[PDB]
RNA sequence: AGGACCGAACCGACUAAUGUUGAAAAAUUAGCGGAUGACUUGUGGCUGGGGGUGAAAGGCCAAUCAAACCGGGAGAUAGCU
RNA sequence: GCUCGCCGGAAGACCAAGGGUUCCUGUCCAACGUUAAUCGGGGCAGGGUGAGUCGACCCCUAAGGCGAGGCCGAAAGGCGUAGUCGAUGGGAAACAGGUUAAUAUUCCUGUACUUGGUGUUACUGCGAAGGGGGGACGGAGAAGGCUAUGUUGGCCGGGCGACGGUUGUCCCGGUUUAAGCGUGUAGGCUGGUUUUCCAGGCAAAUCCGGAAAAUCAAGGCUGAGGCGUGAUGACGAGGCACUACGGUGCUGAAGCAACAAAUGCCCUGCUUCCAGGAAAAGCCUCUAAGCAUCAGGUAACAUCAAAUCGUACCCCAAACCGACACAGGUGGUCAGGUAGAGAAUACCAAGGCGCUUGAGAGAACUCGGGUGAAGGAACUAGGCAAAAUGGUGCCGUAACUUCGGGAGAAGGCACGCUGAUAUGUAGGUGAGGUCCCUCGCGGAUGGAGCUGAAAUCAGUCGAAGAUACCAGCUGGCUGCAACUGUUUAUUAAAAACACAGCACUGUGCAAACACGAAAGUGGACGUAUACGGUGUGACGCCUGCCCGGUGCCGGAAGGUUAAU
């Protein structure tokens, strides 16, 4: 058993987009924005047990931030993690 | 032409790199001048 | 056999081959197999030690029993093969239990053969015995100089040693250079002479035949600067010193053996 | 069969012209040599400076070599400008 | 958008290395871009990389590195045992179609596969850090069998022609389909089987190896491709409709045969040669201690798991190495048509470009080319450079020679197209059909159909038929070096180095020698038919005299002579 203080450390943010809009209404998954160091198993525990939701399969991403500019000076921002996570058929979320 | 530098980081790595300077004591001897200068590169190890 | 090649291209124009019909014409026998990895005349520091080597064929290492210590157990002579670690032959023998070894090749040695070590083995080619066990005057080879080292003298090709004479505990031998030697009368020795005769028969032809064999070329010391060599230097071609190595020892002429604790061993050198 | 022959890839660099604040701190164009061999190439490794390596030109060792580079002795010394 | 031109064994496509968001969309034009710029690999914002099967990680080791102890060394430290790292090599498994502005063998649809688990059920010798097998290995060459792929025909759909003709022996396009599973073929290798015994494999062994005897010649292993299924599917020319004119939705014909055919596959094969061609694990098997009815083993079934990291984009390039958006350099993979021996070369397809200043004019001069009267090296240091030769087949071909060569010597003839032989031949392929069978992916016979040189004869056209690109100038005397090779990266490619060969000399093995204060290591897991050094430098005829000087070797009677 995965700990629930972990399963809730786990999730970040939904990730809003044209493809998570349409991998939303068409294949019926959702896209998150999780924690870096955060497993399959660990997103599927969390999704399983903090949406009561059933999680058929979970792949995952890692993307490299961009080097970006302030002024002049430059910078580089955060690299993080997405999740395609696909419900099951009949299963819905807000 | 031909040029001098061909990249590899392996061995750029095992050449120059953090744990081929720690092996041995004149390489500890560069990163304590490295240290002492204050450099922000303080090896090529990425 | 050796065959002079026709010159129908320059390298084979002076080629001699030597040809036997008689060596397996397939794989070596793989549990006496190991690796020899090449060296290319570098020690341990990766500097060149020995000059001149470099290169040439991939060689497997052929486990060749020296020490021959199958005594009383007969063995028969299964085939003979070739071996690229040495200029002479070697034999597949099947001793009765089962176990098979190589051997070196002794002159007249064919397949089908018996062999027998030991003491009270029988005077053919091939048998090892003590030479206080062997009659004066014989040949042998693959002589041991201690007892139990192993045979480390006549190994090549057509190399044989003769046996002259024996005072109790030592026998002096007469060996291919023409030294007169002591060992004592406990080691033994291998009947005949060894194998490959026409060895020395061949000729390579072409530069490369040495560059399949490992050998770079050697440039001469003249052809060099004073600060590579000796001799080098000159404006055109001068010599007017004495023959040197590239370290400054003379080579025309001078001795080099400095071993005081052989010396006893070493009845006359050789002329 | 061949360190065989002709000839592309590939490796090299014999001749001429251009160019020489170049397209290029050595190249282009037209020809040229080898092209199954002592061939060539990728990756990784080893040899360290009076040392390596060298089919040997004092050649090469990061566009630097009759003794690399960097830091230090060091503000060497300079009857010389 | 219509035309034109260029590459097309690349100037197309896919990657590794390397770079690191350069990818896509919106917006901006100050700077950057050798001009303008509304454009951009530029600025700004957002979005984008989805894996049990790809790769890495991981199991394994090579060269080599590190190295407990250890040995050695003023110190630092050097070497190295047990070990442990280390790919560029070995090791389980996924294919087709569809889809995004940008990812896909990663998503979706469909169909598979592998290795581990737990759990039952049947069965019952399991067990290794050990033994054995296997993994497991070279070069060259020859065919044969295939496929990729292409061409033609058939088939289906459409067309009937801006200018003479074109319902036909006419034109255009399409004719695709995988992994897996089953079959086990061409072909390659191999004698099987049973029992007894055994100084061997560090002990053991039922395993391997070796001895016997008996029986059976016929069992086994490997194996491309094909065929069947996968697939009543998917794809598919086109249509039918809506249409933000971008698109989105629906529907969907035929989907066969012959020939040619790889540098790819069978092939880690076969033949042959000498220069004699990695290791270890996974995998299979044998037993050791141990366990004794438990553990474990394989067999089926169920269930669970297969994590983590990379995945965008360039990759020959404007994104890598060259200071540049630099005419340079950069490893691997794919390899269409016509002609052609060909991956050369010419023109094209797919696909991608027109090289980030243009517009005129049409001086000298320079650059790169084209042609040239008469002469033809008189130019010049020198035929430098240009020009010329150039292919296939046949005839023919000198001195000399190491008998191989020289030699493609030199020199010369033919070459297009049409028709006939023969409405397309010889040859190749090989169907129907028939027959046989120990029956199949069978064996004969059979010749349909397809493909298809070359030659002779006759005719005909042009100035010219190897018509373009492509593509040897030849010969004579002579010096040097035998040759092939190598060399001054960046003014010297040579007669210089090397070379095979020859000779001298050292070296008896703890070899000489060399690198190392040393331990040690190379020589060499070699042993005088070996190794090192030196000189000469194929082959042929030869290599003469001098030991006084300088070296080296041998001598040990005398003189001299160190520390002590
Ligand atoms: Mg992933
Ligand atoms: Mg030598
Ligand atoms: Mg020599
Ligand atoms: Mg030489
Ligand atoms: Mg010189
Ligand atoms: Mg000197
Ligand atoms: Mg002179
Ligand atoms: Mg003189
Ligand atoms: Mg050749
Ligand atoms: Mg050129
Ligand atoms: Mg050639
Ligand atoms: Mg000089
Ligand atoms: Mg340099
Ligand atoms: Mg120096
Ligand atoms: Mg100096
Ligand atoms: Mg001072
Ligand atoms: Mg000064
Ligand atoms: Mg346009
Ligand atoms: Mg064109
Ligand atoms: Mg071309
Ligand atoms: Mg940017
Ligand atoms: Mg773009
Ligand atoms: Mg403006
Ligand atoms: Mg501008
Ligand atoms: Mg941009
Ligand atoms: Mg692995
Ligand atoms: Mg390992
Ligand atoms: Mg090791
Ligand atoms: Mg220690
Ligand atoms: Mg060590
Ligand atoms: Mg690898
Ligand atoms: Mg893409
Ligand atoms: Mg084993
Ligand atoms: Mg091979
Ligand atoms: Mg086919
Ligand atoms: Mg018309
Ligand atoms: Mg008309
Ligand atoms: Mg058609
Ligand atoms: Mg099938
Ligand atoms: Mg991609
Ligand atoms: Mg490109
Ligand atoms: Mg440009
Ligand atoms: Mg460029
Ligand atoms: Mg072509
Ligand atoms: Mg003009
Ligand atoms: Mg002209
Ligand atoms: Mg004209
Ligand atoms: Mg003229
Ligand atoms: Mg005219
Ligand atoms: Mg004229
Ligand atoms: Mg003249
Ligand atoms: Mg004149
Ligand atoms: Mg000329
Ligand atoms: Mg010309
Ligand atoms: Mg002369
Ligand atoms: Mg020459
Ligand atoms: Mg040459
Ligand atoms: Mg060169
Ligand atoms: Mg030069
Ligand atoms: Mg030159
Ligand atoms: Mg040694
Ligand atoms: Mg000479
Ligand atoms: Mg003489
Ligand atoms: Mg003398
Ligand atoms: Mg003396
Ligand atoms: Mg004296």
Request: glycine share 10%; with cysteine.
């Amino acid at each position: 058993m995965i700990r629930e203080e972990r399963l809730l450390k786990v999730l970040r943010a939904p990730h809003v987009s044209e493809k998570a809009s349409t991998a939303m209404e068409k294949s019926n998954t959702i896209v998150l924005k999780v924690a870096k160091d955060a497993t399959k198993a660990e997103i599927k525990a969390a999704v399983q047990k903090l949406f009561e939701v059933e999680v058929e399969v979970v792949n995952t991403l890692v993307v490299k931030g961009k080097v970006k500019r302030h002024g002049q000076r430059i910078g580089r921002r955060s690299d993080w993690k997405k999740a395609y996570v696909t419900l099951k058929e009949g299963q819905n979320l807000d | 032409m031909k040029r001098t530098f061909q990249p590899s980081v392996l061995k750029r790595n095992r050449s120059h790199g953090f744990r081929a300077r720690m092996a041995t004591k004149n390489g500890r001897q560069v990163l304590a001048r490295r240290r002492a200068k204050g450099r922000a590169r303080l090896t090529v190890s990425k | 056999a050796v065959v002079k090649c026709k010159p129908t291209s320059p390298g084979r124009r002076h080629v001699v081959k030597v040809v036997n019909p008689e060596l397996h014409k397939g794989k070596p026998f793989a549990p006496l197999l190991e690796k020899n990895s090449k060296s290319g005349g570098r020690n341990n520091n990766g500097r060149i030690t020995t000059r001149h080597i470099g290169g040439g064929h991939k060689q497997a290492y052929r486990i060749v029993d020296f020490k021959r210590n199958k005594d009383g157990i007969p063995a028969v002579v299964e085939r003979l093969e070739y071996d690229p670690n040495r200029s002479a032959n070697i034999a597949l023998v099947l001793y009765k239990d089962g176990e098979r070894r190589y051997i070196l090749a002794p002159k007249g040695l064919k397949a089908g053969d018996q062999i027998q070590s030991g003491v009270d083995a029988a005077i053919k080619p091939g048998n090892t015995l003590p030479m206080r066990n062997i009659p004066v005057g014989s040949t042998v080879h693959n002589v041991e100089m201690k007892p139990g080292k192993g045979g480390q003298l006549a190994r090549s090709a057509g190399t044989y040693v003769q046996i002259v004479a024996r005072d109790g505990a030592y026998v002096t031998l007469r060996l291919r250079s023409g030294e007169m030697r002591k060992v004592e009368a406990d080691c033994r020795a291998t009947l005949g002479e060894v194998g490959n005769a026409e060895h020395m028969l061949r000729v390579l032809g072409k530069a490369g035949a040495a560059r399949w064999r490992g050998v770079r070329p050697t440039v001469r010391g003249t052809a060099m600067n004073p600060v590579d060599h000796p001799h080098g230097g000159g404006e055109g071609r001068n010599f007017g010193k004495h023959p040197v190595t590239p370290w400054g020892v003379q080579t025309k002429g001078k001795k080099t053996r400095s071993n005081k604790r052989t010396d006893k061993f070493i009845v006359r050198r050789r002329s």
